[PDB]
């Protein structure tokens, strides 16, 4: 609908390599802008770069592409599906945003996390550090990273995934935790709060170099007749 | 020379042969530095000297430019005229170079200088010929490389220029003609180009030559490091994983680009580059192989198996994802996405096969390539720069740490740490004065790995093993005379006396004591060689009782007992003996306090505790003279009655009969108990059959013919007596139907007068080519109108006289080193049948000696000092082959006999050869099964032996088997190096031991070339003597023109008939070589060769008193020997080469004939040199935490180094070596 937007998208389509399906993305951008559609779907189009995005979109579906960098994110955006890309960094995240799935990428550092972030999936990345988690965050996925430590968890957090990392110590887990994915790390001990989780919570700490005092304590607590904590898997 | 062409100088052959004997005279008339002068004076005072010296001016050069042409024609075989011209100019350059420093440079040149130049520069000229015959194109490009390569002739530079032409051709023709062919071409050039690059080949080279050598080394590095890529990766990645094939061709060229600017891989720059190309190709192809790039699954952190592409698109293996497959939750650790619990996970095989298959193959090719790069980095004489070694040893860890198998990747991890020796050995190949810091750093970061367990005695025994191997295969076995100084030098490191310096000290002391051990344990009777073995012994004397550490003597006792046996060590220390020096014990007083019984191990203890109880009961019955308890002990135990009888007979031998061995007749069994035990064999119903009862009664009263009043002098008839009595028991009480031939070989061995004894040489020309064909008048013709060369019969190549013999065919056991068999039997099983036949004939040579005298076909005088010294040789060979100690080898013989006995589940005469073959192959199926069970049954035997009451008090019986810390309160125990595991005795590695590992870890289908080399290695080291017996077999034919009456028949007279002693000395040195080769190979010729030799011919050894008709290679009579020997050597060589015309898989026929034969075309490999250290090097040791180091030979690498250093390709065809009078 917009003349400047259509001109920019036409130039972007005309400036694409043969491997990219820029005609389909161009037509879909025109359709989304004309109808003010809430969701823009450009996934599995072998796109390497993206032009200026429609400002009214709330969900961005750009997974399974060859994108290395992303343009400015619209301020009304809420959910991002940009997994399976070649992204090295991410732009500023909108405040209205809630959902990211940036797994299977080559990012090294994350920008500031929005206050309304709900679920985070940055697995299979090259992160060496994490930003401070938002208070409302419920799920974070940082599996297969190079993290040496993890920031303190919020009190509304329900799911944690940190397998295949280099974390040495775990902060105290909130009672809202119901599933902890913690295998393949350099952990020598577990915080006591892991014993205070709900009975139906799931925790696996296999592959961790837990000390003898730690496994003695865990064996004493978990095998007790009055134990009501979560089920912990060591293998 | 072709038709109508003549010699360049008249009578060119006589001049050359005249000069080549004046040179021989000058050899012994003076020393090495006197030759260049004396040869010239000798040829200058000769009449030909003035005949030529009168000629002056440029005519001189004329003659010379002719002579050194014809010389080449009379010494080499120039394929074309261009090669002849190139060799001419090369030899002219060499001659001028020699004349440059001659006290008369460029005044007048003379004929002897050509001979001097060729003799000094023979290796370079022949290597040049090899280069120009591997690929002729090199000469073509070299043809214009005289204007292109301005050739100023003052030194031999032509070979290096040819090397550059060839290597530029290689660089400009990479992968071009079906890269397999390029691979074979570079591998064929490997030897000549490396020799050119080798420093000890171009000693006298000049500045230009040194520069061109530098340049050719620079190109050869990249050509050869790339070369191995082309071998492991391209050639092979994709025979199997195809999609990658063309893909790999993309990166190979890139590899050269990475090495194009610089190719010095043993440097920071170039090495950090190869590593990079390789990593990149790996990643790129992994990506291609799959849509998203393949990576191992999260929880398993191993690989991927039976997976499925979930909505998470993460192939996660089933039984590892069982945490979610059993708790019934539906997320994967990577994505955590969850569709509701209703979906059923499964297996996607098409993806699964690809992932699993790619992983195994990708990991193998890359590892091979990396290994081959570290071994072109660790090559010449100095370790790579500090950064290179730091990056190498730092690559062993993942930061599951330190589970990396020396790979530049980061994806494969095995398990909890497995410390390997791949990096330590290639780093220790140099001297222990420049790699000390590297190894100490390696072990210091090794102990900080993951809190290595405190029980660190199986890690130090890995570093000590690797240090000992390097010391023993780096300078301990390379020398020929320097040992005379080494034996003194180690003596020095006995006058002045855990980190790596201390570990090296410990290993060197262990090897010093190891050599002192087999200097201390050699058969007495030849007492000589005083200086070395007594100065060294006194040095060890002062070292041991000067250090005050009582562990070295413990190691000495352990090595002595593992070399000769327990009894030798026990008898080595008895107060007051003259042969006794009580050195290695510090325990003489304690053993002398318990001197009533020195100690005898019941080696029959491999039966269970049942025989252990029966022997105790029998001993009690005998000493109390009340034997009725035996009659209930037999009832107390419970086995099949045959085993009952065998155990009882062995008990009488061990407790009753053996007492008739002590010279102290007072200790002999008094008749009081003998009467009772004889009576109770009488009332024994278990010994119901007559023969067993008679044998038992004979054993009790010492009336068994084997245990006669006079046995052998020492305890050689002691262990053999034990084995023979066990064989007696097994044959008497055994019920198996295939034991009958061994029974009849004993027990009246007169029926077995016309039977083929098992494991005897067979007529190889009976079961099944290029071999010689027979003319109607019995003459072996050449390879196969055409007529016979001799007697001119109307036949030509273009009956059933089976030479097999019955009885004991082989002769003097004193000449016997390696076992060679047929009929597809393992050497271990083959020996243990040749040891059970000698154990069924020695007992047979006790009832009637004359009957066996008619069986041993090379007749002897006493078939009881013959067969016992034969069984001693059998045991010595078995010890080397299995690697166990002497006592354990007697034990394995006993265990094999037990397996024959405890077996309760085709002829009884062995009348026909095929029937003997069938009996062999049917007893091999019973001997073999619990012969591979020697890793668990032997420890059980050792426990039962060093657990019994008889010896579990002797000090020496605890040093050998138990732990000396328990009973000796004088061993220094402060450090880890003082534990009784480091000072234990390992098994020495020999060529014969490897012949057992190769055929155990199946090697008739996995390493065919190594198997065909090892199983014929005994007589293959004699092939290198072919260029010597093809020289005196052609120097005689020339000398012996047709005289048709060679009357004289004594080589000694011929050797004395020559004047000018030096010449007869040379003929003596050659005839000795021929005689040594014939005497050391004659026995195999008569039953293995193809030229039918009269059976008397290969019967007795030859020396300098036989007929002169031997040497002449005539086709009939005495000359058939000197033809059969050469034919057999040629057959061995071409058989090995044909075995190489395998896996290389491409036909290649150099096909040198037996008149051009030189040192290059024969497999020339002395055993202590290249063969022994190479096998020691590839022995790699892996230690797993909580587990002892495991010896692991790498058979593929050994085979590759064998074929790429001796067996590349050099085939042969027999068409001469004949009296062309």
Is A184 within 8 Å of B298 when comparing Cβ atoms?
yes
Whole-number Å distance between alpha carbons of A148 and A131: 13
Check A164 against B298: CB less than 8 A apart.
yes
Judged by a CB distance cut-off of 8 A, whether residue B301 touches chain A is: yes
Q: How many helices (H) and strands (E) does chain B have?
A: 51, 5
SS (H, E, C) B458-477: CCHHHHHHHHHHHHHHHCCC
β partners of residue B365: none
C-beta atoms of A183 and B335 within 8 A: no
* B1023-B1028-B1032 Cα angle (round to 5): 135
Sign of the four-CA dihedral B255, B260, B266, B267: negative
CA distance B1086 to B1076: 17
Residue of B418, B366, B423, B363 whose CA lies nearest to B391: B423
Domain regions of chain B by residue span: 12-204, 258-320+350-447, 460-599+956-978, 603-704, 737-760+807-927+937-945, 773-798, 991-1015+1167-1203, 1023-1165
Strand ranges of the sheet holding A59-61, from the earlier edge strand across to the other edge? A39-41, A59-61, A79-81, A99-101, A119-121, A139-141, A159-161, A179-181, A202-204, A231-233
Q: Please enumerate, as own/partner, the contacts of B257-266 that have beta carbons within 8 Å and a separation of 24 or more.
A: B259/B221, B259/B222, B259/B225, B259/B226, B260/B222, B263/B218, B263/B219, B263/B221, B263/B222, B263/B225, B264/B218, B264/B221, B265/B221, B265/B225, B265/B373, B265/B376, B265/B377, B266/B377, B266/B378, B266/B379, B266/B384, B266/B385, B266/B388
DSSP state, A133? P
| DSSP string across B489-551 | HHHHTTT----HHHHHHHHHHHHHHHHHHHHHSS-TT----HHHHHHHHHHHHHHHHHH--TT
Residue B975's nearest CA partner among B539, B489, B498, B635 is B498
Query: Could you tell me the two tokens for B404?
Result: 């990396």
Q: In the numeric block, which tokens belong to residue B224?
A: 């050869």
Experimental method: cryo-EM
**Is the distance from CB of B1042 to CB of B1221 less than 8 angstroms?**
yes
DSSP summary character for residue B667: G
Angstrom distance (rounded) from CA B680 to CA B685: 9
Distance CA B266, CA B375 (A): 10
Instruction: Map tokens 């290796």 to a residue.
Output: B123
Q: How far is A125 from chain B (nearest CA, A)?
A: 11
What is the helix (H) or strand (E) element at residue B1182, kind and residue range? Answer: strand B1179-1184
Q: Are B841 and B728 in contact (CB under 8 A)?
A: no
Express the helix, strand and coil content of chain A in percent, nearest 5 each: 20, 15, 70
Nearest CA in chain A to B326: A233
Rounded to 5 degrees, what are φ and ψ at B992? -70, -35
Residue (of B537, B505, B668, B560) closest to B956 by Cα position: B560
| B454 interfacial to chain A (CB closer than 8 Å) | no
- Closest chain B residue to A165, measured at CA: B298
- Give the Å distances, CA to CA, from B551 to A16, B556, B963: 79, 9, 12
Any A CB within 8 A of B336 CB: yes
**Helix intervals (H) in B1004-1119:** 1008-1014, 1026-1029, 1032-1039, 1051-1057, 1062-1079, 1082-1088
Print burial letters for A92-106: b (CB count within 10 Å at least 16), e (below 16): ebbeebbbbbbbbbe
Are B1068 and B1032 a contacting pair, CB within 8 Å?
Answer: no
Buried/exposed code over A121-142 (b: 16+ C-beta within 10 A; e: otherwise): bbbbbebeebeebbeebbbbbb
| DSSP state string for B1129-1170 | HHHHHHHHHHHHTTTT-S-----EETTT--GGGS----IIII
Q: Which helix (H) or strand (E) holds B120?
A: helix B111-120
Residue B334 is nearest to which of A124, A204, A233, comparing CB atoms?
Answer: A124
Give which of B736, B724, B753, B750 is closest to B840, Cα–Cα: B724
Scored b (16 or more CB within 10 A) or e, B1191-1218 reads: eebebebbbbbbbeebbbbbbbebebbb
Cα–Cα dist B1049/B16, whole Å? 30
Q: CA nearest A200 in B: which residue?
A: B327
Q: Transcribe B978-1027 into DSSP letters.
A: GSTTTTSPPPPP-HHHHHHHHHHS--SSSSHHHHHHHTT-TTTTTGGGHH
Cβ distance A202 to B329 less than 8 Å, yes or no, reads: yes
CA distance B401 to B411: 12
Q: Cα dist. B432→A78, B470, B500, B695, B710 in Å?
A: 67, 9, 10, 63, 55
In this structure, how many other beta carbons lie within 10 angstroms of the beta carbon of residue B274? 23
Bridge partners of A161? A141, A181
Instruction: Give the mutation candidate from B334, B398, B402, B411 for the A interface (greatest A CB count, under 10 A).
Output: B334
Q: A189 and A170 in contact (C-beta within 8 Å)?
A: no
Which residue out of A66, A204, A211, A230 would a mutagenesis test of the B interface target, given it has the greatest number of B Cβ atoms within 10 Å? A204
Q: Which residues contact B671 (CB under 8 A, 6 or more apart)?
A: none
The Cα–Cα gap between A101 and A80 comes to 6
Residues of B in contact with A207 (CB under 8 A): 299, 301
Residues B329, A233: C-beta atoms closer than 8 Å: no
Q: What angle do CA B588, B592, B597 make, to 5 degrees?
A: 125
CA of B424 vs chain A CAs: smallest distance (Å): 28
Choose among A123, A164, A202: nearest Cβ to B335. A123
Identify which of B299, B336, B450 has the shortest CB distance to residue A159. B336
| Whole-angstrom distance, CA of residue A33 vs CA of residue B1104 | 110
Q: What does the block give as tokens for A89? A: 């960094």
With H, G, I as helix, E, B as strand and everything else as coil, classify residue B1033. helix
Give Cα separations from B1061 to B25, B40, B615, B1064, B1177 (angstroms): 8, 20, 72, 5, 46
Signed CA dihedral, B236, B238, B244, B246: sign only: positive
Query: What is the secondary structure of B298-363 as a DSSP string?
Result: TTT-S---S----TT-----TTTTHHHHHTT----TTT-----TTS-----HHHHHHHHHHHHHHH
Pairing of strands B1179-1184, B1190-1193: antiparallel
Instruction: Give φ, ψ of A180 to 5 degrees.
Output: -115, 125
**Residues ≥6 apart with Cβ < 8 Å to B320:** B297, B299, B300, B302
Chain A contact present for B325, CB below 8 A = no
A161 CA to chain B: closest CA distance, Å? 7
How close A183 comes to chain B (CA, Å)?
Answer: 7
> Does the CB of B299 have a partner CB in chain A at under 8 Å?
yes
d(CA B240, CA B1077): 47
> Contact at 8 Å (CB) between B401 and B415?
no
Q: Say whether residue B327 is in contact with chain A using an 8 A CB cutoff.
A: yes
> Which strands make up the sheet holding B418-419, listed edge to edge?
B418-419, B1179-1184, B1190-1193
Residue A73, min C-alpha distance to chain B (Å): 24
CB-based burial label for B770 (10 Å; 0-12, 13-18, 19+): middle
B1050 and chain A: CB distance < 8 Å anywhere?
Answer: no
State whether B336 and A181 contact (CB < 8 Å): yes
Q: Is B32 on the interface with A (CB under 8 A)?
A: no
Token look-up 């009664």 returns: B697
Q: Which two tokens stand for residue B274?
A: 């190869």
Give which of B335, B417, B449 to mutate to test A binding, by max A Cβ within 10 Å.
B335
Distance from CA of A42 to the nearest CA of B (A): 18
Give the chain B residue nearest A185 (alpha carbons).
B400
Spatial separation of the C-alpha atoms in residues B560 and B584, rounded to whole Å: 10
Question: Which chain B positions have a beta carbon within 8 Å of A181's beta carbon?
Answer: 333, 336
Give CA–CA dist B546/B540, Å, rounded. 10
Q: B11 — alpha (psi -120 to 50), left (phi > 0) or beta? A: left
Which residues make beta-bridge pairs with A141?
A121, A161
Buried b (16+ CB within 10 A) or exposed e, B279-316: eebbeebbeebeeeebbbbbbbbbbbbbbbebebbbbb
The reply to whether residue A164 touches residue B450, judged by beta carbons under 8 angstroms, is no
């Amino acid at each position: 609908m917009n003349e400047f937007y259509l001109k920019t998208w036409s130039e972007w389509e005309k400036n694409g390599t043969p491997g990219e399906q820029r005609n389909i993305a161009f037509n879909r951008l025109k359709i989304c802008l004309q109808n003010q559609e809430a969701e823009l779907n450009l996934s599995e189009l072998d796109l390497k770069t993206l032009p200026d995005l429609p400002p009214q979109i709330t969900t961005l579906e750009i997974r399974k592409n060859l994108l290395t960098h992303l343009p400015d994110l619209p301020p009304m955006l809420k959910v991002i599906h940009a997994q399976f890309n070649q992204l090295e960094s991410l732009p500023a995240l909108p405040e209205t945003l809630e959902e990211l799935n940036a797994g299977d990428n080559k990012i090294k550092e994350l920008p500031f996390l929005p206050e309304n972030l709900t679920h985070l999936r940055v697995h299979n990345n090259r992160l060496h550090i994490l930003p401070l988690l938002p208070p409302e965050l419920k799920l974070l996925v940082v599996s297969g990273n190079r993290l040496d430590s993890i920031p303190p968890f919020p009190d509304k957090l329900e799911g944690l995934a940190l397998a295949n990392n280099f974390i040495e110590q775990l902060p105290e887990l909130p009672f809202s935790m119901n599933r902890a994915v913690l295998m393949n790390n350099n952990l020598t001990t577990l915080p006591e709060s892991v014993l205070r989780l709900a009975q139906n919570a799931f925790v696996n700490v296999a592959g961790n170099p837990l000390s003898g005092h730690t496994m003695r304590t865990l064996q004493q607590i978990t095998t007790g007749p009055d134990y009501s904590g979560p089920r912990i898997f060591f293998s | 020379l072709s038709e109508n062409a003549s010699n360049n100088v008249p009578f060119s052959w006589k001049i050359k042969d005249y000069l080549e004997e004046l040179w021989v005279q000058a050899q012994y008339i003076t020393d090495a530095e006197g030759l260049p002068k004396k040869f010239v004076d000798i040829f200058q005072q000769t009449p030909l000297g003035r005949f030529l010296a009168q000629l002056h001016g440029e005519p001189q050069q004329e003659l010379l430019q002719c002579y050194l042409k014809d010389f080449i024609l009379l010494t080499m075989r120039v394929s074309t005229e261009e090669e002849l011209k190139f060799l001419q100019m090369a030899l002219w350059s060499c001659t001028r170079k020699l004349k440059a420093a001659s006290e008369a440079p460029e005044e007048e040149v003379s004929l002897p200088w050509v001979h001097l130049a060729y003799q000094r520069f023979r290796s370079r000229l022949q290597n040049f010929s090899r280069i120009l015959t591997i690929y002729p194109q090199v000469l073509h490009s070299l043809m214009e490389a005289r204007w292109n390569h301005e050739l100023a002739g003052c030194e031999m530079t032509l070979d290096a220029f040819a090397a550059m032409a060839c290597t530029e051709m290689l660089t400009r023709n990479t992968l071009k003609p079906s890269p397999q062919a390029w691979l074979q071409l570079v591998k064929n050039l490997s030897m000549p180009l490396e020799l050119i690059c080798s420093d000890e080949h171009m000693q006298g080279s000049g500045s230009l030559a040194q520069a061109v050598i530098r340049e050719v080394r620079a190109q050869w590095s990249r050509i050869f490091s790339t070369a191995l890529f082309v071998e492991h990766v391209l050639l092979g990645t994709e025979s199997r994983v195809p999609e990658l094939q063309g893909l790999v061709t993309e990166h190979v060229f890139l590899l050269d680009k990475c090495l194009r600017e610089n190719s010095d891989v043993k440097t920071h720059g170039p090495f950090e580059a190869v590593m990079r190309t390789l990593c990149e190709c790996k990643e790129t192809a992994s990506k291609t192989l799959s849509r998203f790039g393949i990576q191992p699954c999260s929880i398993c952190l191993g690989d991927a198996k039976d997976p499925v592409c979930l909505p998470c698109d993460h192939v996660h293996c089933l039984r590892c994802l069982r945490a979610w497959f059993a708790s019934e939750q539906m997320i994967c650790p990577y994505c955590l996405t969850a569709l509701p619990d209703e979906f059923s996970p499964a297996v996607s095989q098409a993806h699964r096969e690809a992932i699993e298959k790619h992983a195994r193959f990708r990991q193998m090719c890359n590892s091979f390539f990396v290994d081959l790069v570290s071994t072109i980095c660790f090559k010449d004489n100095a370790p790579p720069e500090k950064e290179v070694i730091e990056s190498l040893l730092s690559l062993l860890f993942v930061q599951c740490e330190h589970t990396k198998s020396l790979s530049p990747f980061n994806d494969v991890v095995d398990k909890t740490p497995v410390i390997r020796s791949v990096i330590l050995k290639l780093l220790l190949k140099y001297s222990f004065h420049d790699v000390k810091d590297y190894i100490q750093e390696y072990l210091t970061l090794l102990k900080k790995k993951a809190f290595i367990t405190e029980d660190k005695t199986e890690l130090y025994m890995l570093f000590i093993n690797c240090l000992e191997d390097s010391i023993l295969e780096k300078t301990s076995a390379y020398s020929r005379n320097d040992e005379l100084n080494h034996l003194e030098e180690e003596g020095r490191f006995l006058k002045a006396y855990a980190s790596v310096e201390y570990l090296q000290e410990v290993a060197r002391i262990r090897l010093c004591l190891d050599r002192a051990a087999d200097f201390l344990s050699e058969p007495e009777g030849g007492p000589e060689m005083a200086k070395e073995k007594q100065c060294y012994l006194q040095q060890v004397k002062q070292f041991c009782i000067r250090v005050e550490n009582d562990w070295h003597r413990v190691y000495l006792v352990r090595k002595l007992s593992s070399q000769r046996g327990m009894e030798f060590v026990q008898g080595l220390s008895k107060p007051g003996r003259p042969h006794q020096w009580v050195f290695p014990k510090d325990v003489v007083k304690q053993q002398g306090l318990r001197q009533d019984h020195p100690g005898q191990m019941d080696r029959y203890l491999v039966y269970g505790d049942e025989y252990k109880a029966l022997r105790d009961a029998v001993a009690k019955a005998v000493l109390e003279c009340k034997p009725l308890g035996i009659k209930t002990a037999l009832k107390a135990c419970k086995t099949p009655q045959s085993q009952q009888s065998a155990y009882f007979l062995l008990t009488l031998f061990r407790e009753v009969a053996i007492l008739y061995r002590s010279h102290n007749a007072s200790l002999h069994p008094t008749p009081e108990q003998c009467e009772a035990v004889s009576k109770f064999i009488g009332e024994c119903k278990i010994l119901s059959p007559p023969d067993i009862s008679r044998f038992a009664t004979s054993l009790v009263d010492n009336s068994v013919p084997l245990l006669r009043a006079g046995p052998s002098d020492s305890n050689l008839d002691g262990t053999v007596t034990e084995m023979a009595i066990h064989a007696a028991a097994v044959l008497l009480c055994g019920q198996n139907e295939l034991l009958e031939p061994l029974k009849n070989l004993a027990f009246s061995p007169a029926t077995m007068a016309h039977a083929f004894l098992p494991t005897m040489p067979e007529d190889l020309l009976a079961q099944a080519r290029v071999h010689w064909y027979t003319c109607p008048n019995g003459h072996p013709c050449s390879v196969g109108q055409s007529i016979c060369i001799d007697c001119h019969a109307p036949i030509g190549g273009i009956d059933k006289a089976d030479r097999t013999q019955t009885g004991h065919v082989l002769g003097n056991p004193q000449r016997r080193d390696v076992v060679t068999c047929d009929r597809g039997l393992p050497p271990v099983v083959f020996l243990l049948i040749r040891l059970l036949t000698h154990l069924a004939l020695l007992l047979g040579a006790s009832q009637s000696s004359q009957a066996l005298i008619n069986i041993i076909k090379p007749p002897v005088r006493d078939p009881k000092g013959f067969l016992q010294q034969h069984i001693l040789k059998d045991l010595e060979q078995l010890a080397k082959m299995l690697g166990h100690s002497a006592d354990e080898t007697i034990g394995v013989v006993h265990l094999v006999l037990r397996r024959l006995l405890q077996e309760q589940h085709f002829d009884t005469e062995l009348s026909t050869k095929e029937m003997r073959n069938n009996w062999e192959k049917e007893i091999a199926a019973v001997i073999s099964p619990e012969l591979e069970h020697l890793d668990k049954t032997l420890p059980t035997m050792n426990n039962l032996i060093s657990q019994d009451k008889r010896i579990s008090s002797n000090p020496v019986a605890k040093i050998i088997y138990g732990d000396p810390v328990t009973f000796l309160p004088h061993l220094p125990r402060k450090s880890v190096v003082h534990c009784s595991k480091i000072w234990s005795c390992r098994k020495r590695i020999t060529v014969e031991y490897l012949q057992h590992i190769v055929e155990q870890k199946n090697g008739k289908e996995r390493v065919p070339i190594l198997w065909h080399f090892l199983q014929k290695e005994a007589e293959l080291r004699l092939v290198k003597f072919l260029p010597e017996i093809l020289a005196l077999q052609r120097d005689l034919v020339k000398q012996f023109q047709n005289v048709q009456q060679v009357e004289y028949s004594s080589i000694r007279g011929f050797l004395s008939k020559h004047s000018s002693d030096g010449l007869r000395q040379l003929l003596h040195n050659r005839i000795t070589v021929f005689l040594s080769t014939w005497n050391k190979l004659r026995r195999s010729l008569e039953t293995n060769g193809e030229i039918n030799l009269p059976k008397d011919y290969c019967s007795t050894d030859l020396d300098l008193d036989t007929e002169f008709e031997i040497l002449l290679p005539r086709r009939r009579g005495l000359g058939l020997c000197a033809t059969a020997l050469v034919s057999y050597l040629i057959r061995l060589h071409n058989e090995i080469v044909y075995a190489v015309e395998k896996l290389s898989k491409e036909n290649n026929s150099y096909s040198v004939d037996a008149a051009e034969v030189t040192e290059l075309h024969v497999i020339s490999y002395e055993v202590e040199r290249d063969l022994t250290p190479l096998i020691l090097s590839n022995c790699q040791y892996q230690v797993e935490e909580g587990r002892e180091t495991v010896q692991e030979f790498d058979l593929e690498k050994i085979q590759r180094q064998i074929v790429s250093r001796f067996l590349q390709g050099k085939p042969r065809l027999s068409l001469k070596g004949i009296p062309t009078l």
